[PDB]
């Protein structure tokens, strides 16, 4: 099996090339012996709409058969369902087969073992499993079980909207379709649906609402059919994108604002985690309604387990997961995220618009990407780390560096997946922007003059 499908927080591979059907059975293989490992027979599996979802999901199954598990086979489904429903069964453990918003021929793994999800080393640990033969063998079962109408019942029942909504759902023919726009209808709104039929081919936009381009239909429907509201699913339905009745795209930094001020508002003191590229501007607030802001790292896992970690009510981060616990479980899910948006823009008076710009704004740059070489890019920031000069800075080394200034604030780090620098930078001041982009450009020469800073 290649190395490289071997992720970080997941398993991630092309279908024809680097992931096979063959390399799926022994990844069952290595995650039930895991599972076993730590005393978890009982694991549920789900997959997205992608083509290849049929063959690979039975020989992750047989595969965990093979260990001696008993597979609750929960079908197509989006992410967070798997989630839930390794939540609400027996088991603890769970596999999601998805290539979330990757083009057609990828697909993988989001795996979670006894309450844990996967990252880095134990990730790793699967494999190593494989080239070892360190695999448990057994006589395993298989349950059929249909678990979407139970999660709908959970989300609908908890749920309580006041005025009506008329929202525009985009799930770019990616598995949000099953339910998304059935559910958001149920809790009480009329749903102008978009690429809502679950389509591997992904013959319109990519089901991605973090770039704007795939939220251009999402906007132009919002404007022309007069609604309040439009929500944008990624392809596996963890993440959510949202635009208001006039088209502003609302990210994920602000989003969190509105969640935070409504949980906190039930929970004084409450843990809130959000990652090092998101505003200044939330870590006030937070700590203004008297909650307790907590800066973490990019990624899913890790915010998920620096929520466990941290007892956190509430986390999100900029790529669009939003991590309830809550009145929830604790884990991303865009489709319950919708829910918990509609139920407090709809104990408002003012439009989605006005809900969203009555919070303090800075002015932001679009985020960067400097190209630089696989070999270089951690050393580049192991440099800065070493070398950098930031002044009076509230200097920040969890994820690459992050620079809070009184008045906004920089941040560099190294893409984990792609031989890339990332850069984001927002202040009060376009003064203030243009100072803070001057720092970090002349910091970045001062470790490599040749490095292409274009800011
Ligand atoms: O890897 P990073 O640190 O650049 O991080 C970026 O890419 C990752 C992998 O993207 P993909 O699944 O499409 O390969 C995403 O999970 C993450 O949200 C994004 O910010
Ligand atoms: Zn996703």
Same mark, same amino acid.
Request: net charge negative; proline share 15%.
């Given at each position: 099996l290649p190395a490289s499908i071997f992720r970080a927080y997941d398993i991630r591979g092309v279908?024809?090339?680097?992931?096979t059907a063959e390399t799926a059975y022994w990844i069952g293989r290595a995650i039930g012996s895991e599972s076993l490992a730590r005393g978890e027979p009982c694991v549920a599996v789900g997959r997205d709409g992608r083509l290849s979802g049929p063959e690979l999901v039975k020989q992750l199954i047989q595969g965990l058969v093979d260990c001696g598990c008993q597979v609750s086979d929960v079908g197509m489904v989006p992410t967070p369902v798997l989630y839930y429903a390794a939540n609400v069964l027996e088991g603890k453990s769970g596999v999601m087969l998805t290539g979330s918003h990757? *083009? *057609?021929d990828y697909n993988g793994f989001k795996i979670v073992v006894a309450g844990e999800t996967l990252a880095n080393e134990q990730i790793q640990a699967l494999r190593e499993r494989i080239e070892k033969n360190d695999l448990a063998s057994g006589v395993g079962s298989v349950e059929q079980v249909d678990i979407l109408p139970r999660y709908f019942k959970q989300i609908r029942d908890d749920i309580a909207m006041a005025k009506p909504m008329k929202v525009v759902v985009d799930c770019?023919?990616?598995?949000?379709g099953v339910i998304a726009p059935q559910l958001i209808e149920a809790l009480g709104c009329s749903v102008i649906p978009?690429?809502?039929?679950?389509?591997?081919?992904?013959?319109?936009?990519? *089901?991605?609402?973090?770039?704007?381009e795939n939220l251009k239909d999402l906007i132009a429907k919002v404007k022309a059919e007069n609604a309040d509201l439009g929500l944008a699913f990624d392809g596996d339905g963890d993440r959510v994108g949202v635009v208001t009745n006039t088209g502003t795209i609302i990210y994920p930094d602000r989003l969190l604002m509105l969640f935070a001020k409504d949980v906190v508002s039930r929970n004084p003191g409450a843990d809130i985690i959000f990652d090092?590229?998101?505003?200044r501007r939330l870590i006030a607030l937070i700590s203004g309604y008297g909650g307790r802001p907590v800066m973490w790292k990019t990624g899913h896992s890790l915010i998920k387990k620096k929520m466990k970690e941290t007892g956190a009510l509430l986390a999100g981060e900029m790529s669009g997961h939003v991590f309830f616990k809550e009145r929830w479980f604790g884990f991303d899910d865009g489709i319950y995220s919708a829910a918990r948006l509609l139920e407090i823009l709809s104990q408002d008076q003012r439009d989605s618009e006005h809900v969203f710009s009555a919070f303090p704004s800075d002015i932001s740059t679009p985020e960067i990407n400097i190209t630089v070489t696989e070999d270089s890019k951690f050393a580049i920031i192991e440099a800065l780390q070493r070398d950098a000069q930031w002044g009076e800075g509230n200097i920040?080394?969890?994820?690459?560096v992050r620079v809070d200034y009184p008045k906004g604030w920089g941040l560099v780090r190294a893409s984990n997946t792609t031989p890339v620098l990332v850069l984001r930078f927002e202040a009060d001041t376009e003064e203030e922007l243009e100072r803070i982009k001057t720092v970090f450009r002349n910091q970045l020469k001062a470790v490599d003059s040749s490095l292409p800073v274009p800011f």
């Open positions: 279908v024809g090339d680097t992931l990757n *083009p *057609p770019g023919n990616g598995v949000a978009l690429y809502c039929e679950v389509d591997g081919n992904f013959p319109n936009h990519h *089901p991605d609402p973090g770039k704007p090092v590229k998101c505003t920040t080394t969890l994820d690459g």
